[PDB]
């Protein structure tokens, strides 16, 4: 999986998946590559999470191109199954997006993980 770059480590993936779970409860999460593509176009995406083992990986590889154009942090997590369960659905999710909201109750944790992805880029 060389194309999956950057790939978060085990310690960081737990922090990302924790935020994805909290965002799902607050309905601040968009699930699926197509919805993640939209949020980038609308400019409402804090950052994008993607799954490395998605086969073929190219189906989600357009998102980095949009993200670097729009100055949006993005990161890969090793497992799509774990991402889907973290999202709170019954299917494997290859990509997800955290919708922007400055009045959210989990504002601090999103920005905390956001910085680590920025450093990790």
């Amino acid at each position: 999986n060389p194309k999956a770059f950057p790939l978060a480590d085990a310690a960081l993936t737990q922090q990302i998946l924790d935020v994805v779970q909290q965002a799902a409860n607050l309905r601040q999460l968009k699930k699926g590559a197509n919805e993640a593509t939209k949020t980038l176009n609308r400019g409402i995406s804090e950052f994008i999470i993607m799954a490395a083992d998605c086969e073929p990986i190219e189906i989600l590889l357009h998102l980095p191109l949009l993200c670097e154009d729009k100055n949006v942090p993005y990161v890969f997590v090793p497992s799509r199954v774990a991402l889907g369960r973290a999202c709170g659905v019954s299917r494997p999710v290859i990509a997800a997006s955290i919708t922007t909201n400055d009045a959210s109750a989990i504002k601090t944790q999103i920005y905390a993980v956001k910085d680590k992805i920025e450093t990790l880029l």
Binding site: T13, Q14, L17, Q21, S79, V81, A82, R85, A86
Partner: protein, 119 residues
């Protein structure tokens, strides 16, 4: 906590052990009767659950394995007959927010043995 059977190999004696959950990935193992602190096992992340598995060796001989899982899904297996040293590490495929782990089909807390041969 959970209670298991530990065989002291160098004397071949068998006794009970009480296993507890620590604050930071810590599992503290006590002697069931005397209450002495025998050994401790550590894992990375937040310990969420653990279980005990028995592996027979020969006539009258068995070893106790402590299986501990992290909330991320990483699983440690400690050999309690060798000062609680790790013997295997693996990850729960697709695991996230793990909450419990259990073994079945052999001896355990729910189906304990009555003698060594039944392990």
């Amino acid at each position: 906590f959970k209670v298991a059977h530990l065989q002291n190999s160098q004397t071949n004696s068998v006794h009970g052990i009480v296993l507890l959950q620590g604050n930071n990935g810590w599992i503290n193992i006590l002697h069931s009767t005397s209450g002495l602190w025998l050994m401790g096992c550590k894992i990375e992340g937040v310990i969420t659950d653990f279980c005990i598995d028995y592996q027979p060796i020969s006539r009258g001989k068995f070893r106790t394995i402590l299986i501990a899982v992290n909330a991320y899904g990483e699983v440690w297996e400690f050999d309690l007959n060798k000062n609680g040293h790790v013997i295997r590490r693996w990850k729960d495929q697709g695991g996230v927010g793990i909450t419990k782990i259990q073994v079945g089909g052999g001896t355990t807390t729910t189906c304990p043995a009555l003698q060594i041969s039944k392990i």
